[PDB]
Tab-separated table of C-alpha atoms (C1' of nucleotides) and ligand atoms in Angstrom:
chain	number	residue	atom	x	y	z
W	1	UNK	CA	115.990	86.090	138.787
W	2	UNK	CA	118.951	84.554	136.950
W	3	UNK	CA	122.194	86.506	137.500
W	4	UNK	CA	124.445	87.732	134.648
W	5	UNK	CA	126.847	84.900	135.522
W	6	UNK	CA	124.003	82.366	135.272
W	7	UNK	CA	122.896	83.810	131.888
W	8	UNK	CA	126.498	83.660	130.601
W	9	UNK	CA	126.625	80.003	131.701
W	10	UNK	CA	123.387	79.299	129.754
W	11	UNK	CA	124.886	80.969	126.637
W	12	UNK	CA	128.112	78.961	127.071
W	13	UNK	CA	126.240	75.621	127.483
W	14	UNK	CA	124.152	76.476	124.410
W	15	UNK	CA	127.240	77.329	122.384
W	16	UNK	CA	128.998	74.136	123.505
W	17	UNK	CA	125.992	72.069	122.415
W	18	UNK	CA	125.291	73.913	119.136
W	19	UNK	CA	128.996	73.719	118.239
W	20	UNK	CA	128.490	69.956	117.959
W	21	UNK	CA	125.586	70.280	115.507
W	22	UNK	CA	126.518	69.074	112.003
W	23	UNK	CA	128.331	71.851	110.151
W	24	UNK	CA	126.966	72.119	106.625
W	25	UNK	CA	128.674	74.095	103.866
W	26	UNK	CA	126.267	76.107	101.694
W	27	UNK	CA	127.146	78.091	98.574
W	28	UNK	CA	124.983	81.205	98.472
W	29	UNK	CA	124.443	84.297	96.288
W	30	UNK	CA	126.049	87.421	97.707
W	31	UNK	CA	124.584	89.787	95.121
W	32	UNK	CA	126.304	91.331	92.143
W	33	UNK	CA	126.605	87.903	90.545
W	34	UNK	CA	129.081	86.774	93.213
W	35	UNK	CA	128.888	83.522	95.160
W	36	UNK	CA	130.041	82.912	98.709
W	37	UNK	CA	130.074	80.209	101.380
W	38	UNK	CA	128.197	79.996	104.678
W	39	UNK	CA	128.776	77.342	107.345
W	40	UNK	CA	125.517	76.485	109.092
W	41	UNK	CA	125.346	74.521	112.329
W	42	UNK	CA	122.147	72.624	111.718
W	43	UNK	CA	119.945	71.132	114.421
W	44	UNK	CA	118.985	67.509	113.563
W	45	UNK	CA	115.751	66.830	111.660
W	46	UNK	CA	114.415	64.539	114.397
W	47	UNK	CA	115.023	63.744	118.041
W	48	UNK	CA	117.443	63.645	119.722
W	49	UNK	CA	118.492	67.220	118.883
W	50	UNK	CA	121.125	67.893	121.547
W	51	UNK	CA	121.235	68.446	125.286
W	52	UNK	CA	118.581	70.966	126.268
W	53	UNK	CA	116.843	71.166	122.881
W	54	UNK	CA	113.297	70.177	121.958
W	55	UNK	CA	111.081	70.831	118.941
W	56	UNK	CA	107.880	72.776	119.514
W	57	UNK	CA	106.966	73.229	115.848
W	58	UNK	CA	107.922	72.131	112.310
W	59	UNK	CA	110.697	74.742	112.286
W	60	UNK	CA	110.541	75.872	115.928
W	61	UNK	CA	112.743	74.703	118.806
W	62	UNK	CA	113.306	75.664	122.432
W	63	UNK	CA	116.290	75.456	124.779
W	64	UNK	CA	115.591	74.472	128.381
W	65	UNK	CA	117.805	74.493	131.485
W	66	UNK	CA	116.893	73.884	135.129
W	67	UNK	CA	118.660	76.306	137.488
W	68	UNK	CA	118.251	76.014	141.264
W	69	UNK	CA	115.183	73.783	140.820
W	70	UNK	CA	113.466	76.221	138.411
W	71	UNK	CA	112.872	75.316	134.765
W	72	UNK	CA	113.848	78.086	132.336
W	73	UNK	CA	113.003	77.864	128.646
W	74	UNK	CA	113.861	80.103	125.689
W	75	UNK	CA	113.290	80.144	121.965
W	76	UNK	CA	116.231	78.159	120.628
W	77	UNK	CA	117.686	81.052	118.593
W	78	UNK	CA	117.138	83.699	121.294
W	79	UNK	CA	119.839	82.404	123.649
W	80	UNK	CA	122.812	84.360	122.149
W	81	UNK	CA	120.919	87.575	122.880
W	82	UNK	CA	119.882	87.024	126.502
W	83	UNK	CA	122.076	89.944	127.652
W	84	UNK	CA	120.585	92.332	125.064
W	85	UNK	CA	117.585	94.650	125.227
W	86	UNK	CA	114.473	92.727	124.220
W	87	UNK	CA	112.725	95.611	122.426
W	88	UNK	CA	113.655	98.627	120.336
W	89	UNK	CA	111.535	101.553	119.105
W	90	UNK	CA	108.614	99.875	120.898
W	91	UNK	CA	108.950	96.700	118.813
W	92	UNK	CA	109.858	93.246	120.121
W	93	UNK	CA	113.299	91.946	119.185
W	94	UNK	CA	113.391	88.669	117.252
W	95	UNK	CA	116.144	86.269	116.362
W	96	UNK	CA	116.802	86.857	112.678
W	97	UNK	CA	118.670	84.442	110.414
W	98	UNK	CA	121.247	86.090	108.164
W	99	UNK	CA	121.591	82.692	106.458
W	100	UNK	CA	117.770	82.219	106.073
W	101	UNK	CA	118.215	78.615	107.348
W	102	UNK	CA	115.845	78.020	110.334
W	103	UNK	CA	117.632	74.795	111.414
W	104	UNK	CA	120.877	76.749	111.697
W	105	UNK	CA	121.807	77.814	115.247
W	106	UNK	CA	125.219	79.284	114.333
W	107	UNK	CA	125.220	82.543	116.366
W	108	UNK	CA	127.490	84.080	113.719
W	109	UNK	CA	124.457	83.731	111.415
W	110	UNK	CA	121.976	85.413	113.772
W	111	UNK	CA	121.068	88.949	114.654
W	112	UNK	CA	118.555	90.492	117.034
W	113	UNK	CA	116.112	92.944	115.463
W	114	UNK	CA	112.481	93.836	114.872
W	115	UNK	CA	110.302	91.410	112.941
W	116	UNK	CA	110.027	93.987	110.141
W	117	UNK	CA	113.840	94.200	109.832
W	118	UNK	CA	113.984	90.408	109.951
W	119	UNK	CA	111.394	89.934	107.180
W	120	UNK	CA	112.950	92.602	104.976
W	121	UNK	CA	116.193	90.694	104.744
W	122	UNK	CA	114.327	88.163	102.547
W	123	UNK	CA	114.406	90.653	99.653
W	124	UNK	CA	117.811	92.268	100.240
W	125	UNK	CA	120.163	92.395	97.219
W	126	UNK	CA	122.973	91.190	99.484
W	127	UNK	CA	126.356	92.356	100.755
W	128	UNK	CA	127.749	92.560	97.203
W	129	UNK	CA	124.546	93.754	95.551
W	130	UNK	CA	123.697	96.891	97.486
W	131	UNK	CA	122.697	95.847	101.020
W	132	UNK	CA	122.129	98.935	103.184
W	133	UNK	CA	121.408	97.054	106.431
W	134	UNK	CA	123.544	98.573	109.191
W	135	UNK	CA	124.175	95.035	110.403
W	136	UNK	CA	125.102	93.764	106.955
W	137	UNK	CA	123.468	90.767	105.314
W	138	UNK	CA	125.557	87.646	104.852
W	139	UNK	CA	123.819	86.814	101.586
W	140	UNK	CA	121.344	87.987	99.004
W	141	UNK	CA	117.828	87.395	100.276
W	142	UNK	CA	116.159	84.244	98.951
W	143	UNK	CA	113.251	86.265	97.528
W	144	UNK	CA	115.312	89.000	95.843
W	145	UNK	CA	114.558	89.461	92.165
W	146	UNK	CA	112.057	90.693	89.589
W	147	UNK	CA	109.141	88.767	91.093
W	148	UNK	CA	106.324	86.985	89.267
W	149	UNK	CA	103.576	89.597	89.087
W	150	UNK	CA	100.567	88.273	87.178
W	151	UNK	CA	98.917	91.574	86.293
W	152	UNK	CA	100.070	95.180	86.578
W	153	UNK	CA	98.260	98.458	87.088
W	154	UNK	CA	95.462	98.940	84.542
W	155	UNK	CA	92.052	100.555	83.987
W	156	UNK	CA	89.304	99.859	81.408
W	157	UNK	CA	88.174	103.491	81.122
W	158	UNK	CA	89.586	106.988	81.765
W	159	UNK	CA	88.427	107.600	85.366
W	160	UNK	CA	91.937	107.443	86.787
W	161	UNK	CA	95.360	109.104	86.619
W	162	UNK	CA	98.450	107.725	88.411
B	1	UNK	CA	79.478	86.516	88.170
B	2	UNK	CA	79.992	83.657	85.748
B	3	UNK	CA	79.914	85.487	82.351
B	4	UNK	CA	82.774	87.598	80.935
B	5	UNK	CA	80.174	90.295	80.172
B	6	UNK	CA	78.965	90.170	83.781
B	7	UNK	CA	82.570	90.391	85.063
B	8	UNK	CA	83.341	93.364	82.773
B	9	UNK	CA	80.143	95.003	84.080
B	10	UNK	CA	81.367	94.509	87.683
B	11	UNK	CA	84.787	96.005	86.840
B	12	UNK	CA	83.194	98.978	85.029
B	13	UNK	CA	80.733	99.644	87.902
B	14	UNK	CA	83.588	99.416	90.438
B	15	UNK	CA	85.764	101.857	88.412
B	16	UNK	CA	82.916	104.357	88.074
B	17	UNK	CA	82.264	104.321	91.856
B	18	UNK	CA	85.969	104.353	92.860
B	19	UNK	CA	86.553	107.102	90.278
B	20	UNK	CA	84.290	109.333	92.419
B	21	UNK	CA	86.358	108.728	95.594
B	22	UNK	CA	88.372	111.770	96.776
B	23	UNK	CA	91.671	112.108	94.923
B	24	UNK	CA	94.430	112.663	97.479
B	25	UNK	CA	97.877	113.794	96.388
B	26	UNK	CA	100.762	112.001	98.127
B	27	UNK	CA	104.382	113.011	97.698
B	28	UNK	CA	106.567	109.944	97.946
B	29	UNK	CA	110.241	108.918	97.889
B	30	UNK	CA	111.279	107.341	94.594
B	31	UNK	CA	114.774	106.308	95.640
B	32	UNK	CA	117.956	107.980	94.470
B	33	UNK	CA	117.089	111.071	96.479
B	34	UNK	CA	114.176	111.848	94.142
B	35	UNK	CA	110.546	112.535	95.053
B	36	UNK	CA	107.375	111.970	93.038
B	37	UNK	CA	103.639	112.437	93.344
B	38	UNK	CA	100.889	109.799	93.390
B	39	UNK	CA	97.146	110.431	93.121
B	40	UNK	CA	95.325	107.979	95.382
B	41	UNK	CA	91.566	107.501	95.120
B	42	UNK	CA	90.755	106.980	98.783
B	43	UNK	CA	87.717	105.178	100.139
B	44	UNK	CA	86.021	107.229	102.901
B	45	UNK	CA	86.974	106.624	106.524
B	46	UNK	CA	83.385	105.845	107.511
B	47	UNK	CA	80.073	104.816	106.010
B	48	UNK	CA	78.768	105.485	103.452
B	49	UNK	CA	81.750	104.389	101.357
B	50	UNK	CA	80.136	104.191	97.926
B	51	UNK	CA	77.630	102.042	96.093
B	52	UNK	CA	78.541	98.396	96.576
B	53	UNK	CA	81.221	98.942	99.250
B	54	UNK	CA	81.278	97.913	102.905
B	55	UNK	CA	84.009	97.707	105.535
B	56	UNK	CA	84.816	94.274	106.940
B	57	UNK	CA	87.923	95.291	108.884
B	58	UNK	CA	89.870	98.357	110.078
B	59	UNK	CA	91.542	98.521	106.663
B	60	UNK	CA	89.579	95.820	104.815
B	61	UNK	CA	86.618	96.419	102.469
B	62	UNK	CA	84.467	94.322	100.166
B	63	UNK	CA	82.603	95.089	96.947
B	64	UNK	CA	79.186	93.453	96.540
B	65	UNK	CA	76.806	93.218	93.554
B	66	UNK	CA	73.496	91.361	92.981
B	67	UNK	CA	73.719	89.343	89.713
B	68	UNK	CA	71.283	86.550	88.707
B	69	UNK	CA	69.319	87.565	91.888
B	70	UNK	CA	72.349	86.293	93.952
B	71	UNK	CA	74.865	88.392	95.930
B	72	UNK	CA	78.439	88.206	94.588
B	73	UNK	CA	81.122	89.663	96.882
B	74	UNK	CA	84.848	90.334	96.471
B	75	UNK	CA	87.711	91.918	98.377
B	76	UNK	CA	87.531	95.608	97.389
B	77	UNK	CA	90.989	95.656	95.695
B	78	UNK	CA	90.545	92.331	93.844
B	79	UNK	CA	87.886	93.562	91.397
B	80	UNK	CA	90.260	94.922	88.681
B	81	UNK	CA	91.788	91.449	88.381
B	82	UNK	CA	88.665	89.268	88.160
B	83	UNK	CA	89.682	88.033	84.670
B	84	UNK	CA	93.218	87.137	85.756
B	85	UNK	CA	94.504	83.782	87.012
B	86	UNK	CA	93.934	83.611	90.750
B	87	UNK	CA	97.211	81.797	91.430
B	88	UNK	CA	100.799	81.740	90.235
B	89	UNK	CA	103.272	78.915	90.778
B	90	UNK	CA	100.698	77.468	93.182
B	91	UNK	CA	100.636	80.645	95.306
B	92	UNK	CA	97.494	82.724	95.740
B	93	UNK	CA	97.383	86.012	93.865
B	94	UNK	CA	96.763	89.067	96.018
B	95	UNK	CA	95.898	92.640	95.327
B	96	UNK	CA	99.076	94.578	96.053
B	97	UNK	CA	99.299	98.338	96.615
B	98	UNK	CA	102.143	100.031	94.762
B	99	UNK	CA	101.308	103.155	96.788
B	100	UNK	CA	101.247	101.215	100.114
B	101	UNK	CA	98.019	103.060	100.973
B	102	UNK	CA	95.283	100.561	101.821
B	103	UNK	CA	92.399	103.067	101.521
B	104	UNK	CA	93.462	103.773	97.942
B	105	UNK	CA	91.430	101.937	95.304
B	106	UNK	CA	93.115	103.499	92.231
B	107	UNK	CA	93.664	100.487	89.927
B	108	UNK	CA	96.691	102.322	88.486
B	109	UNK	CA	98.210	101.799	91.953
B	110	UNK	CA	97.380	98.068	92.189
B	111	UNK	CA	98.967	94.918	90.880
B	112	UNK	CA	98.122	91.232	91.201
B	113	UNK	CA	100.903	89.058	92.590
B	114	UNK	CA	101.903	86.552	95.245
B	115	UNK	CA	101.780	87.649	98.883
B	116	UNK	CA	105.581	87.285	98.948
B	117	UNK	CA	106.007	89.703	96.005
B	118	UNK	CA	103.488	92.013	97.681
B	119	UNK	CA	105.302	92.040	101.021
B	120	UNK	CA	108.718	92.488	99.429
B	121	UNK	CA	107.731	95.811	97.901
B	122	UNK	CA	107.790	97.223	101.460
B	123	UNK	CA	111.601	97.190	101.325
B	124	UNK	CA	112.169	98.066	97.656
B	125	UNK	CA	114.646	100.915	97.015
B	126	UNK	CA	112.159	102.295	94.500
B	127	UNK	CA	111.968	103.155	90.808
B	128	UNK	CA	114.874	105.618	91.021
B	129	UNK	CA	116.909	103.683	93.588
B	130	UNK	CA	117.313	100.290	91.955
B	131	UNK	CA	113.890	98.611	91.871
B	132	UNK	CA	114.160	95.364	89.907
B	133	UNK	CA	110.467	94.433	90.083
B	134	UNK	CA	109.308	93.421	86.602
B	135	UNK	CA	106.114	95.324	87.332
B	136	UNK	CA	107.919	98.418	88.557
B	137	UNK	CA	107.352	100.025	91.930
B	138	UNK	CA	105.756	103.467	92.044
B	139	UNK	CA	107.754	104.475	95.127
B	140	UNK	CA	110.499	103.399	97.469
B	141	UNK	CA	109.104	100.956	100.015
B	142	UNK	CA	108.188	102.491	103.378
B	143	UNK	CA	110.536	100.120	105.244
B	144	UNK	CA	113.574	100.615	103.025
B	145	UNK	CA	116.670	101.617	104.966
B	146	UNK	CA	119.421	100.483	107.336
B	147	UNK	CA	117.115	99.016	109.969
B	148	UNK	CA	117.505	99.248	113.739
B	149	UNK	CA	119.255	96.003	114.614
B	150	UNK	CA	119.920	95.761	118.356
B	151	UNK	CA	122.644	93.118	118.291
B	152	UNK	CA	124.672	91.577	115.491
B	153	UNK	CA	126.192	88.125	115.080
B	154	UNK	CA	128.494	87.203	117.939
B	155	UNK	CA	129.933	84.303	119.896
B	156	UNK	CA	131.487	83.999	123.346
B	157	UNK	CA	133.833	81.087	122.595
B	158	UNK	CA	135.600	79.699	119.541
B	159	UNK	CA	133.114	77.081	118.372
B	160	UNK	CA	131.839	78.839	115.238
B	161	UNK	CA	132.918	80.206	111.860
B	162	UNK	CA	130.827	82.210	109.432
Q	1	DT	C1'	116.134	67.523	135.767
Q	2	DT	C1'	115.428	65.988	131.233
Q	3	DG	C1'	113.467	64.575	126.639
Q	4	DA	C1'	109.901	64.391	123.419
Q	5	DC	C1'	106.074	65.433	122.410
Q	6	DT	C1'	101.540	68.533	122.747
Q	7	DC	C1'	98.953	73.107	122.208
Q	8	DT	C1'	98.243	78.126	120.912
Q	9	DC	C1'	100.236	82.936	119.869
Q	10	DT	C1'	102.408	87.557	117.054
Q	11	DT	C1'	102.905	90.571	113.123
Q	12	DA	C1'	101.602	93.046	108.982
Q	13	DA	C1'	101.208	92.289	104.320
V	1	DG	C1'	96.718	90.181	102.487
V	2	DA	C1'	91.435	87.161	102.607
V	3	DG	C1'	86.180	84.770	103.075
V	4	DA	C1'	81.667	84.705	105.116
V	5	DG	C1'	77.373	85.744	108.506
V	6	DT	C1'	73.833	88.971	110.811
V	7	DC	C1'	70.680	92.101	110.660
V	8	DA	C1'	67.601	96.157	108.857
J	1	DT	C1'	68.495	94.974	96.830
J	2	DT	C1'	71.542	97.617	99.284
J	3	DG	C1'	73.924	99.118	103.410
J	4	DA	C1'	76.432	98.584	107.753
J	5	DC	C1'	77.987	96.107	110.667
J	6	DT	C1'	79.904	91.307	112.865
J	7	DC	C1'	83.250	87.274	112.953
J	8	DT	C1'	87.403	84.429	111.746
J	9	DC	C1'	91.032	83.141	108.182
J	10	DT	C1'	96.060	83.005	105.320
J	11	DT	C1'	100.985	83.435	105.014
J	12	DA	C1'	105.809	83.133	106.421
J	13	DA	C1'	108.924	85.611	108.966
N	1	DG	C1'	109.043	84.954	114.184
N	2	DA	C1'	107.057	83.354	119.756
N	3	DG	C1'	105.212	81.230	124.843
N	4	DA	C1'	103.627	77.404	127.660
N	5	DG	C1'	101.667	72.286	129.316
N	6	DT	C1'	101.961	67.069	130.029
N	7	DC	C1'	104.071	63.000	131.346
N	8	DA	C1'	107.388	59.785	132.934
C	1	MG	MG1	114.265	85.989	108.882
C	2	MG	MG1	101.463	95.404	99.966
C	3	ZN	ZN1	123.365	79.449	109.064
C	4	ZN	ZN1	120.804	93.517	103.633
C	5	ZN	ZN1	97.233	104.912	95.771
C	6	ZN	ZN1	110.386	97.564	93.373
DNA sequence: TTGACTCTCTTAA
DNA sequence: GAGAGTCA
DNA sequence: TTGACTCTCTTAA
DNA sequence: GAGAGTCA
């Protein structure tokens, strides 16, 4: 098994490498009609991505290090959380983008939470619009708003009551 | 089937059958510390379900009718919306439970919207807690709340800014 | 040991 | 959140 | 014609 | 949102 020291060295090598990813300034809604700025550290669109990084899907990457002749590989956004519990309330912990930018590997834009918590951030009103997430959102969710519902509740007869 | 008359006949037959399903009272959070009551018309847990209905998954059903000597079949919750556009902004329209109760087939608890709009209702603060859905929620979403995030954004070094 | 690809999988709407 | 096939 | 099962699929985190 | 294989 990797020791704590070895895990800390993986996190440090990952941070070193990600810290050299292009830093992109994004203006984002915070909720309440306010605008803010996020600084995303974006993995390149095509190879090479950076030492240890490889793309396993359109918006999926992995980080790989070989320690004492053994190859270790992690989801590319999971590395900041290698010293954390990997489940909570019986649910698997996932890397969760507070900036909603998959290419971003800025650990200040990531949290570690259930997939349900992760998904729900997509619709959050944001840190200035009423976010109640205990680990606060950095921005209004990209899908927040009135929606585009095509048809609402309706009946042709009188068989139903709400 | 093809004709508007045939489609109205399907909707009317579906409503009559669903209207005979047991009416179950559910007390629900509305947001804002308020509680309300919904009347769900719940398909039975096991066969027989009702004329035209059959279970294709743990919480999936289909409605089937023979028209023009051919079998026409639909997802059980899609029938109220057979005269509506089946897409919006290039996204497929889905039946979406405002009561978040899949066995319920009350059309006064259903709307017709993108899967994204559908999902997002799970986290809505509700009609008395700030729901902004243009087709208003009937209750606070079951996943609304602070979440259970295990670890927040963090870095070991000084490579990153928010 | 490393890069750049390949494949399939999980969840809950 | 879906569509479609196999039997009786 | 109708009922009661079976299977896999879609989406975007 | 994930894990793992192949090849040089
Ligand atoms: Mg996310
Ligand atoms: Mg729903
Ligand atoms: Zn970011
Ligand atoms: Zn939030
Ligand atoms: Zn209902
Ligand atoms: Zn709502």
